Design an enzyme around this catalytic site. Structure first.
Site, PDB file in Angstrom:
ATOM      1  N   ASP A  59       0.817  -1.204   0.000  1.00  0.00           N
ATOM      2  CA  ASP A  59       0.000   0.000   0.000  1.00  0.00           C
ATOM      3  C   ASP A  59       0.863   1.271   0.000  1.00  0.00           C
ATOM      4  O   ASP A  59       0.424   2.319  -0.457  1.00  0.00           O
ATOM      5  CB  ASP A  59      -0.930   0.003   1.214  1.00  0.00           C
ATOM      6  CG  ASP A  59      -2.038   1.012   1.072  1.00  0.00           C
ATOM      7  OD1 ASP A  59      -2.779   0.937   0.070  1.00  0.00           O
ATOM      8  OD2 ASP A  59      -2.164   1.886   1.953  1.00  0.00           O
TER       9      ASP A  59
ATOM     10  N   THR B 250     -12.853   8.440 -11.974  1.00  0.00           N
ATOM     11  CA  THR B 250     -11.824   7.861 -11.125  1.00  0.00           C
ATOM     12  C   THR B 250     -12.225   6.559 -10.407  1.00  0.00           C
ATOM     13  O   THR B 250     -11.408   5.944  -9.723  1.00  0.00           O
ATOM     14  CB  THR B 250     -11.310   8.927 -10.121  1.00  0.00           C
ATOM     15  OG1 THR B 250     -10.025   8.535  -9.620  1.00  0.00           O
ATOM     16  CG2 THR B 250     -12.284   9.101  -8.971  1.00  0.00           C
TER      17      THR B 250
END
Ligand SMILES: *[C@@H]1O[C@H](CO)[C@@H](O[C@H]2O[C@H](CO)[C@@H](O[C@@H]3O[C@H](CO[C@H]4O[C@H](CO)[C@@H](O)[C@H](O)[C@@H]4O)[C@@H](O)[C@H](O[C@H]4O[C@H](CO)[C@@H](O)[C@H](O)[C@@H]4O)[C@@H]3O)[C@H](O)[C@H]2NC(C)=O)[C@H](O)[C@H]1NC(C)=O
Ligand SMILES: *[C@@H]1O[C@H](CO)[C@@H](O[C@H]2O[C@H](CO)[C@@H](O)[C@H](O)[C@H]2NC(C)=O)[C@H](O)[C@H]1NC(C)=O
Ligand SMILES: *[C@@H]1O[C@H](CO)[C@@H](O[C@H]2O[C@H](CO)[C@@H](O)[C@H](O)[C@H]2NC(C)=O)[C@H](O)[C@H]1NC(C)=O
Ligand SMILES: [Ca+2]
Length: 475
Positions: free
Chosen positions: A340, A466
């Site tokens: 991440d 998005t």
């Protein structure tokens, strides 16, 4: 080959949809480990709405119909939680709008009820109407965290860059479809402050701006430049708006070009141990932050889209380097899924990761994977723009790794450590974007050509928001 792979992705989608319908529908999401439900998105059924555009593209009529029927009974005026203008816009608003453009166009023969389809636009309007008071501020810059019952807010003094700059695509699309200019005007006025940054010190390099905006005057409150979470989306929409309507948003493009070039010249960064890899850094006051996030990997796709649309081989070349870098974070871990967040500052390499860094080119700051799609998103564009098979393979390698380490009896779960066997421990969480993005980009990479596929040059008739929701371009 591809047909078999495409069908494999449809199975993974069906799998999660079955578990969601089985234990959570119509709540916002399925909790994949305890087989329960959660409502992190105001309770109007986020996973159902986000899955719509993907189901339509996959041609799963049964799924589409169940979602359309639920959209008709949603009451967007009621929720017990505060609402995020940004999240609600990119998932719910764009999700219904996308469904509408798809079912009204390339997928016109998938569903019978024309009333359920028209309902998508009606409900999109009702949602915008309940949220528009957010824009009623001195400058026009909205409050992102609002209470739709008592038109109150967070009390916040500033609004983030991405949360302010990632609303124009869907609010302008709503205006274009309804004939009501109010939605376009509100969002574009908010966006205007981002296009002409003040003070000038808030724009360190041409096109690169600060991370927060004062709601009172619309001026930037800091000069921290970055493509990371909280900023990302702003730049993404600059070029996408140009693709939506080049005649109306030429200015957005000019602004993205500046940002693109300054990013290449100043944010470009190479790890000491791996001069061959390229990542983007963050910049504040002449100081550089050598770390990145999975979220930032959307960058390669942005450079590739703008590159092919503007016919700038240099943006395409750079986008491919960013793509390679993100692919590096994926194929260097034990699970073959990227972390991440990571860093590459030689002075901060953790002792226990010294040797990993020396060979991989980075150290892991957070090894969790929350079913994010940004890396696969960029791989998808790389394949569409170059036509090279290697990028499609990388999409598949990632998809198989996710299917193998994140899959549970009911769906897919987030994982705690991508560099440990089986991903460490599973989180009892399955975000809405699993349906909207991970499954769509994975399928599109192996599915047949069609209007909704990303195209080269000026042939795009659809542009992705998005949250991976395909919106029809203007005219
Ligand atoms: C795990 O991740 C690795 C990191 O992403 C990945 O490594 C490779 O990833 C790419 C695989 O295709 C590869 O990119 C290609 O590199 C080619 C060779 O580059 C060398 O020569 C050039 C000189 O031109 C130097 O500048 C480089 O430093 C390097 O020495 C390059 O020729 C090629 O470019 C052609 O193709 C692109 C489109 O694909 C066109 O746009 C371009 O015009 C050319 O026609 C392309 O850039 C990358 O270099 C390499 N990364 C590294 C650091 O090794 C692994 O493949 C992956 N592992 C697995 C198993 O998946
Ligand atoms: C949004 O604002 C409304 C005000 O209309 C809040 O409503 C509640 O306000 C109090 C909260 O403890 C109580 O009186 C009731 O729970 C309820 N009453 C009203 C005024 O309707 C609501 O809590 C706010 N939303 C949240 C959770 O922030
Ligand atoms: C993704 O994972 C699923 C489940 O592990 C794979 O499907 C399996 O389905 C059955 C068990 O659930 C069995 O038939 C096999 O274990 C497997 N299916 C096959 C190939 O026989 C699925 O294949 C995985 N997706 C891919 C393409 O790797
Ligand atoms: Ca995104």
């Amino acid at each position: 080959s591809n047909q078999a792979k495409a069908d494999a992705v449809k199975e993974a989608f069906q799998h999660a949809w079955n578990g969601y319908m089985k234990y959570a529908f119509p709540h916002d999401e399925l909790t994949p480990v305890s087989n329960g439900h959660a409502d992190s998105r105001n309770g109007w059924g986020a996973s159902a709405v986000d899955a719509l555009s993907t189901a339509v593209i996959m041609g799963k009529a049964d799924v589409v119909n169940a979602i359309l029927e639920h959209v008709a009974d949603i009451d967007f005026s009621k929720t017990s939680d505060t609402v995020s203008l940004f999240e609600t816009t990119i998932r719910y608003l764009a999700g219904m709008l996308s469904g509408y453009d798809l079912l009204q166009g390339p997928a016109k023969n998938l569903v019978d009820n024309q009333d359920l389809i028209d309902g998508l636009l009606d409900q999109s309007r009702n949602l915008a109407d309940v949220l528009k008071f957010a824009f009623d501020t001195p400058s026009g810059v909205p409050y992102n965290n609002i209470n739709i019952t008592s038109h109150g807010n967070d009390g916040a003094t500033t609004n983030g860059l991405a949360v302010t700059g990632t609303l124009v695509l869907e609010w302008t699309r709503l205006s274009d479809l309804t004939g009501d200019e109010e939605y376009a005007k509100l969002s574009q006025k908010a966006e205007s402050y981002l296009l002409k940054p003040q003070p000038s010190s808030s724009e360190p390099f041409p096109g690169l701006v600060g991370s927060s905006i004062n709601i009172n005057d619309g001026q930037f409150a800091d000069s921290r430049v970055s493509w990371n979470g909280g900023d990302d989306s702003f730049y993404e929409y600059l070029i996408k708006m140009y693709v939506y309507d080049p005649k109306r948003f030429e200015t957005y493009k000019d602004r993205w070009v500046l940002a693109a070039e300054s990013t290449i010249k100043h944010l470009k960064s190479h790890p000491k141990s791996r001069p061959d890899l390229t990542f983007l850094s963050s910049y504040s006051n002449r100081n550089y932050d050598l770390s990145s996030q999975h979220l930032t990997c959307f960058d390669g796709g942005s450079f590739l889209l703008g590159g092919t649309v503007l016919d700038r081989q240099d943006f395409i070349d750079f986008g491919l380097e960013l793509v390679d870098g993100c692919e590096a974070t994926y194929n260097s871990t034990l699970t073959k899924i990227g972390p991440d967040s990571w860093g590459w500052d030689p002075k901060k390499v953790p002792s226990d990761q010294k040797e990993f860094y020396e060979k991989a080119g980075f150290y892991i700051s957070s090894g969790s994977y929350v079913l994010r799609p940004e890396v696969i998103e960029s791989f998808y564009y790389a394949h569409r723009v170059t036509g090279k098979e290697i990028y499609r393979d990388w999409v598949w390698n990632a998809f198989v790794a996710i299917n193998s380490t994140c899959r549970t009896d009911s769906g897919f779960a987030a994982v705690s450590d991508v560099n440990k066997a089986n991903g460490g421990s599973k989180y009892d969480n399955q975000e809405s974007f699993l349906f909207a993005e991970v499954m769509k980009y994975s399928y599109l990479a192996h599915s047949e050509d069609a209007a909704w596929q990303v195209q080269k040059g000026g042939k795009n008739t659809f542009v992705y928001n998005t949250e991976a929701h395909p919106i029809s371009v203007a005219r």
